[PDB]
Design an enzyme around this catalytic site. Structure first.
Site, PDB file in Angstrom:
ATOM      1  N   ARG A  78       0.753  -1.197  -0.080  1.00  0.00           N
ATOM      2  CA  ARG A  78       0.172  -0.035   0.068  1.00  0.00           C
ATOM      3  C   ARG A  78       0.966   1.189  -0.121  1.00  0.00           C
ATOM      4  O   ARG A  78       1.770   1.245   0.776  1.00  0.00           O
ATOM      5  CB  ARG A  78      -0.873  -0.034   1.079  1.00  0.00           C
ATOM      6  N   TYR A 226      -1.146  -4.564  -5.951  1.00  0.00           N
ATOM      7  CA  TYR A 226      -0.914  -4.988  -4.573  1.00  0.00           C
ATOM      8  C   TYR A 226      -1.934  -4.796  -3.430  1.00  0.00           C
ATOM      9  O   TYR A 226      -2.395  -3.597  -3.365  1.00  0.00           O
ATOM     10  CB  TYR A 226       0.580  -4.472  -4.191  1.00  0.00           C
ATOM     11  N   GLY A 228      -3.512  -3.760  -0.428  1.00  0.00           N
ATOM     12  CA  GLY A 228      -4.494  -2.572   0.177  1.00  0.00           C
ATOM     13  C   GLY A 228      -4.693  -1.518  -1.044  1.00  0.00           C
ATOM     14  O   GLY A 228      -5.497  -1.091  -1.081  1.00  0.00           O
ATOM     15  N   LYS A 235      -8.527  -1.965   2.965  1.00  0.00           N
ATOM     16  CA  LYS A 235      -8.559  -0.586   3.493  1.00  0.00           C
ATOM     17  C   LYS A 235      -9.333   0.418   2.692  1.00  0.00           C
ATOM     18  O   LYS A 235     -10.170   1.265   3.533  1.00  0.00           O
ATOM     19  CB  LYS A 235      -7.171   0.055   3.562  1.00  0.00           C
ATOM     20  N   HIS A 255     -10.028   0.261  12.485  1.00  0.00           N
ATOM     21  CA  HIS A 255      -9.063  -0.859  12.362  1.00  0.00           C
ATOM     22  C   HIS A 255      -8.681  -1.508  13.676  1.00  0.00           C
ATOM     23  O   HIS A 255      -7.891  -1.272  14.529  1.00  0.00           O
ATOM     24  CB  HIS A 255      -7.776   0.168  12.020  1.00  0.00           C
ATOM     25  N   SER A 277      -0.281  -1.781  12.395  1.00  0.00           N
ATOM     26  CA  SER A 277       0.466  -2.695  11.571  1.00  0.00           C
ATOM     27  C   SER A 277       1.867  -2.849  12.481  1.00  0.00           C
ATOM     28  O   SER A 277       2.384  -1.985  13.018  1.00  0.00           O
ATOM     29  CB  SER A 277       1.027  -2.387  10.238  1.00  0.00           C
ATOM     30  N   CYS A 279       2.160  -4.391  15.332  1.00  0.00           N
ATOM     31  CA  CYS A 279       2.005  -4.155  16.706  1.00  0.00           C
ATOM     32  C   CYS A 279       1.192  -5.195  17.543  1.00  0.00           C
ATOM     33  O   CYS A 279       0.993  -5.188  18.800  1.00  0.00           O
ATOM     34  CB  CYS A 279       1.279  -2.838  17.024  1.00  0.00           C
ATOM     35  N   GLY A 280       0.769  -6.238  16.778  1.00  0.00           N
ATOM     36  CA  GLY A 280       0.054  -7.214  17.255  1.00  0.00           C
ATOM     37  C   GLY A 280      -1.386  -7.946  17.122  1.00  0.00           C
ATOM     38  O   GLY A 280      -1.530  -8.626  18.139  1.00  0.00           O
ATOM     39  N   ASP A 302      -8.337  -7.459  11.671  1.00  0.00           N
ATOM     40  CA  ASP A 302      -8.080  -6.070  11.260  1.00  0.00           C
ATOM     41  C   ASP A 302      -9.065  -4.875  11.181  1.00  0.00           C
ATOM     42  O   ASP A 302      -8.638  -3.730  11.491  1.00  0.00           O
ATOM     43  CB  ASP A 302      -7.568  -6.445   9.744  1.00  0.00           C
ATOM     44  N   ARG A 396       2.987 -11.312   2.402  1.00  0.00           N
ATOM     45  CA  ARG A 396       1.673 -11.544   3.118  1.00  0.00           C
ATOM     46  C   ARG A 396       1.351 -13.250   2.810  1.00  0.00           C
ATOM     47  O   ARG A 396       1.693 -13.911   1.812  1.00  0.00           O
ATOM     48  CB  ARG A 396       0.551 -10.960   2.426  1.00  0.00           C
ATOM     49  N   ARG A 427       3.866   0.184  20.187  1.00  0.00           N
ATOM     50  CA  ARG A 427       4.940   0.073  20.365  1.00  0.00           C
ATOM     51  C   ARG A 427       5.550   1.331  21.073  1.00  0.00           C
ATOM     52  O   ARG A 427       5.917   2.246  20.548  1.00  0.00           O
ATOM     53  CB  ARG A 427       5.901  -0.425  19.317  1.00  0.00           C
TER      54      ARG A 427
HETATM   55  N1  GDP Z   1       7.219  -8.871  21.920  1.00  0.00           N
HETATM   56  C1  GDP Z   1       6.126  -9.189  21.607  1.00  0.00           C
HETATM   57  N2  GDP Z   1       6.043  -9.187  20.183  1.00  0.00           N
HETATM   58  C2  GDP Z   1       4.913  -9.510  19.744  1.00  0.00           C
HETATM   59  C3  GDP Z   1       3.588  -9.592  20.633  1.00  0.00           C
HETATM   60  N3  GDP Z   1       2.414  -9.751  19.769  1.00  0.00           N
HETATM   61  C4  GDP Z   1       2.804  -9.687  18.420  1.00  0.00           C
HETATM   62  N4  GDP Z   1       4.274  -9.433  18.456  1.00  0.00           N
HETATM   63  C5  GDP Z   1       5.176  -9.313  17.244  1.00  0.00           C
HETATM   64  O1  GDP Z   1       4.870  -8.225  16.602  1.00  0.00           O
HETATM   65  C6  GDP Z   1       5.075  -8.413  15.190  1.00  0.00           C
HETATM   66  C7  GDP Z   1       3.642  -8.456  14.373  1.00  0.00           C
HETATM   67  O2  GDP Z   1       2.674  -9.115  14.940  1.00  0.00           O
HETATM   68  P1  GDP Z   1       1.112  -9.311  14.276  1.00  0.00           P
HETATM   69  O3  GDP Z   1       0.398  -9.988  15.474  1.00  0.00           O
HETATM   70  O4  GDP Z   1       1.214 -10.194  13.072  1.00  0.00           O
HETATM   71  O5  GDP Z   1       0.784  -7.915  14.017  1.00  0.00           O
HETATM   72  P2  GDP Z   1      -0.497  -7.045  13.166  1.00  0.00           P
HETATM   73  O6  GDP Z   1       0.473  -6.556  12.141  1.00  0.00           O
HETATM   74  O7  GDP Z   1      -0.962  -5.815  14.283  1.00  0.00           O
HETATM   75  O8  GDP Z   1      -1.389  -8.159  13.171  1.00  0.00           O
HETATM   76  C8  GDP Z   1       5.266 -10.104  15.067  1.00  0.00           C
HETATM   77  O9  GDP Z   1       6.809 -10.267  14.813  1.00  0.00           O
HETATM   78  C9  GDP Z   1       4.993 -10.695  16.401  1.00  0.00           C
HETATM   79  O10 GDP Z   1       5.747 -11.914  16.812  1.00  0.00           O
HETATM   80  C10 GDP Z   1       3.922  -9.597  22.031  1.00  0.00           C
HETATM   81  O11 GDP Z   1       2.984  -9.566  22.780  1.00  0.00           O
HETATM   82  N5  GDP Z   1       5.108  -9.286  22.464  1.00  0.00           N
HETATM   83 MN    MN Z   2      -4.326  -3.270   8.860  1.00  0.00          MN
END
Ligand code: GDP
Ligand code: MN
Ligand code: MN
Ligand code: NA
Length: 605
Positions: A78, A226, A228, A235, A255, A277, A279-280, A302, A396, A427
């Site tokens: 995107r 590609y 998004g 999105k 989101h 993105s 952040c988990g 998402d 992806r 983060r």
């Molecule tokens: N240290 C830590 N890393 C995390 C945690 N949750 C996700 N991650 C890492 O953050 C990155 C992206 O996580 P993902 O769940 O795919 O995030 P999304 O992009 O928001 O869906 C990956 O490398 C995960 O392993 C957590 O609770 N602690």
């Molecule tokens: Mn997203």
């Protein structure tokens, strides 16, 4: 009349407005063929085999029905800077920043857009098939669903849209003569090709433009094939157009992941969470909880569409039908449920391939048998010593949602799931404790608005929506705040989390992943009204001994939950300057009031 060029379906059986859309664009774009998608298995399989026939995709022989697309490296993400929203007035789309550079959107005038459109779309599908994708965002027929028609010249888009939305004949039947969002896409490489094709991946980077015209209910995207940019649900429709509809109609398009969590007593609640993105969201929505007797189930990872019902419950649906997840960092150890989801019927883009026909990527944490070799996403031999990653960082998986081993039973319930908590987070290596709870709805909205995350520098990403606001962010804050005045509304408790706090040596203070179940347990108890919170200047935090830390002996509790007057003075001054510069005359009174209230609380530390 384009009847002679229809190779599947019938123009005669399309609703009148749909037919108009298709034919108007067939005349403009000049496709060789028109394929009206039915969404059937047969259609899908042959489309895949054809892409395979042409070398556009490769079958991954190690799995059941998995595919790999490797892109032109100019077309890997995107692209925010080529993403715009058209409105009569710029201020309706974005606030006017004092600096002359908005971080909260990208407006284009109608006039500039018409010139751009005319410089791109005429004849752009010559010698290609225009596919017509009728799709539902949300469970088919749900009162909360909205219907789109995407026209595209990319079979990769069709295949991915079948996964990521509900598409096909049933949608056209549901639609009838109703309203729909007009979605127009081209890779922008009419035949005969004017420039060399790279990696069998049609695109036009120089002319890439992803536009949204909320007042015309149109999305118009050119030059990228590609994610998004090209899968126009996902999105463009589900956040950008949808947030504007939501503002108009009194709901929310966000989101956010949506998860259902059940405690040992068998009591279940749904939570939504907005993280940027990387952040988990995927990890949390699919969490394998470490706490015995707890269960997490996934509704979505998402997008959330949320609307208060007659009883005042905030009802959420996942308007998507699949997961379009970043692959790197996905591991069996960290995210077993996602690993199970993607083992069949999945399309991978820009990941590495093992010599036994499997997938690979950074942070997969799966050692390979002696002798097994890796081909990178750039189609080169690759070894773990190498300077470059084997998979593109934004590569992806595109996987049907129904394959998640822990998909919630209500993930397609048409009335949505009742949300009892909304979680914000990103983060933050310093300063921000593991979890806190907002003092009020107004405070919770301020906590949303204040979100920052370290992703290529510490940057503001309010509500995790920075790249996705369909309209003026100040007005979006007012919309959120207005929910408080809905009589009988049952407003979710709002929390803020931080999985990512580090010590001075850069080490994570919290183990995270499944251990985050311990924080959810605290949230669950709080929603139940348990006396498990201590008041602090930034909100409520767990009491000493309130969290279950059994099994985690060496956790630096003092540092993980520490609140520093010095950090928080800096934090509030930075939030004040950002809101002033980026939002200014459009900042609601209540957000300004929360900011002054926070400043005051910190001043009394
Ligand atoms: N240290 C830590 N890393 C995390 C945690 N949750 C996700 N991650 C890492 O953050 C990155 C992206 O996580 P993902 O769940 O795919 O995030 P999304 O992009 O928001 O869906 C990956 O490398 C995960 O392993 C957590 O609770 N602690
Ligand atoms: Mn997203
Ligand atoms: Mn994800
Ligand atoms: Na390719």
């Amino acid at each position: 009349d384009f009847s002679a060029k229809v190779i599947q379906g019938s123009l005669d059986s399309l609703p009148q407005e749909v037919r108009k859309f298709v034919e108007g664009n067939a005349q403009l774009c000049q496709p060789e063929y028109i394929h009206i998608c039915d969404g059937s298995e047969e259609e899908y399989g042959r489309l895949l085999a054809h892409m395979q026939e042409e070398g556009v995709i490769r079958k991954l022989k190690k799995y059941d029905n998995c595919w790999l697309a490797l892109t032109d490296p100019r077309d890997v993400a995107r692209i925010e800077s080529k993403t715009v929203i058209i409105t009569q007035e710029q201020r309706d789309t974005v606030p006017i920043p004092k600096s002359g550079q908005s971080q909260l959107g990208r407006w284009m005038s109608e006039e500039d857009f018409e010139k751009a459109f005319n410089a791109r779309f005429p004849g752009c599908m010559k010698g290609r098939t225009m596919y017509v994708i009728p799709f539902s965002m949300g469970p088919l027929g749900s009162p909360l669903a909205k219907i789109g028609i995407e026209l595209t010249d990319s079979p990769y888009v069709v295949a991915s849209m079948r996964i990521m939305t509900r598409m096909g004949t049933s949608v056209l039947e549901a639609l009838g003569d109703g309203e729909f969002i007009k979605c127009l896409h081209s890779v922008g490489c009419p035949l005969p090709l004017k420039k060399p094709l790279v990696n069998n991946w049609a695109c036009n980077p120089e002319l890439t433009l992803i536009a949204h015209l909320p007042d015309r209910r149109e999305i118009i995207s050119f030059g990228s094939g590609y994610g998004g940019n090209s899968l126009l649900g996902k999105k463009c429709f589900a956040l950008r157009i949808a947030s504007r509809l939501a503002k108009e109609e009194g709901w929310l398009a966000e989101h956010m992941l949506i998860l259902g969590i059940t405690n040992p007593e068998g009591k279940k609640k749904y939570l939504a969470a907005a993280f940027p993105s990387a952040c988990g969201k995927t990890n949390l929505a699919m969490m394998n909880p470490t706490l015995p007797g707890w269960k997490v189930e996934c509704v979505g990872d998402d997008i959330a569409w949320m609307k208060f019902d007659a009883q005042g419950n905030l009802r959420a649906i996942n308007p998507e039908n699949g997961f379009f997840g970043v692959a790197p960092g996905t591991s069996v150890k960290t995210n077993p449920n996602a690993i199970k989801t993607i083992q069949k019927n999945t399309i991978f883009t820009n990941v590495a391939e093992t010599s036994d026909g499997g997938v690979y990527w950074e942070g997969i944490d799966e050692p390979l048998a002696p002798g097994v070799t890796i081909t990178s996403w750039k189609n080169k031999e690759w070894r773990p010593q190498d300077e470059e990653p084997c998979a593109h960082p934004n590569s992806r998986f595109c996987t049907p949602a129904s394959q998640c081993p822990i998909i919630d039973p209500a993930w397609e319930s048409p009335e949505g799931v009742p949300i009892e908590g909304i979680i914000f987070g990103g983060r933050r290596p310093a300063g921000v404790p593991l979890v806190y709870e907002a003092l009020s709805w107004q405070h919770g909205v301020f906590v949303g608005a204040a979100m920052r995350s370290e992703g290529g520098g510490i940057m503001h990403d309010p509500f995790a929506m920075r790249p996705f606001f369909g309209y003026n962010f100040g007005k979006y804050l007012a919309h959120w705040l207005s929910m408080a005045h809905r009589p009988a509304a049952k407003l979710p408790k709002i929390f803020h989390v931080n999985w990512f706090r580090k010590d001075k040596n850069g080490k994570f203070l919290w183990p995270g992943f499944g251990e985050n179940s311990r924080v959810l347990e605290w949230m669950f108890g709080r929603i139940e009204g348990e006396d498990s919170a201590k008041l602090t200047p930034i909100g409520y935090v767990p009491k000493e001994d309130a969290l279950n830390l059994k099994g985690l002996g060496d956790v630096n509790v003092e540092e993980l939950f520490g609140i520093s007057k010095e950090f928080w003075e800096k934090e509030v001054e930075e939030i004040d300057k950002y809101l002033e510069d980026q939002v200014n005359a459009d900042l609601p009174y209540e957000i300004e009031r929360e900011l002054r209230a926070l400043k005051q609380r910190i001043s009394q530390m």
